[PDB]
């Protein structure tokens, strides 16, 4: 199983930083959206559903540093409160075609709300396949804004 970020080189496990551009001004009660489906893609390394990969997001994925913030996480058509207090539903990947991860993060903050370059969220993703032991792998996506976000 492989992933990549903005068409970079392939990733088998571990922590990767994911840089997003955000709206530089937000208002109280307004909701900030981070669409990760534009950035991260994954695929089956053999194709044909021969050794199918099963991926989900993991309990304990949270805001970093922004722990008082409210949020939601959209994953594979379902909305979960964020931070994740349970694992998400499983996405099956069997083709050698990069599939955008169907993942969005909704943030309600509660001056500068997000600093450029600071980790905003740490999202734990788990993979296991079908044959042998399934060769389980853990990925952490460190979500980071290219610009500060301010609220009047």
Ligand X SMILES: CC(=O)N[C@@H]1[C@@H](O[C@@H]2O[C@H](CO)[C@H](O)[C@H](O)[C@H]2O)[C@@H](O)[C@@H](CO)O[C@@H]1O
Contact set with ligand X (CB under 6 A): 1, 44-46, 51, 53, 129, 134-135
* Sheet of strand 99-100, all strands in order from the earlier edge strand to the far edge: 2-5, 40-43, 99-100
C-beta of 73 vs 125, nearer to ligand X: 125
Q: How far is the CB of 99 from ligand X (least distance, A)?
A: 12
Closest C-alpha to 104, from 85, 82, 119, 89: 82
C-beta of 6 vs 45, nearer to ligand X: 45
Distance CA 22, CA 144 (A): 10
Q: How far is the CB of 91 from ligand X (least distance, A)?
A: 13
C-beta of 53 vs 141, nearer to ligand X: 53
Q: How far is the CB of 77 from ligand X (least distance, A)?
A: 23
Token pair belonging to 107: 């943030």
Token pair belonging to 127: 């993979």
């Amino acid at each position: 199983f492989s992933c990549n970020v903005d068409g970079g080189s392939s990733i088998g496990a571990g922590t990767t930083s994911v840089y997003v551009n955000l709206d530089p001004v937000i208002q109280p009660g307004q909701n900030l959206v981070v669409d990760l489906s534009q950035h991260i893609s994954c695929w089956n390394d053999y194709g044909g559903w021969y050794d199918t990969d099963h991926i989900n997001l993991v309990q304990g994925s949270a805001f970093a540093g922004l722990q008082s913030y409210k949020g939601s996480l959209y994953w594979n058509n379902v909305t979960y409160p964020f931070p994740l207090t349970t694992n998400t539903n499983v996405l099956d990947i069997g083709d050698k075609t990069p599939m955008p991860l169907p993942l969005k993060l909704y943030i309600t903050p509660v001056g500068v709300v997000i600093k450029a370059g600071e980790v905003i969220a740490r999202i734990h993703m788990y993979k296991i396949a079908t044959l042998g032991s399934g060769n389980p792998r853990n990925f952490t996506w460190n979500i980071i804004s290219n610009n500060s976000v301010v609220m009047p």
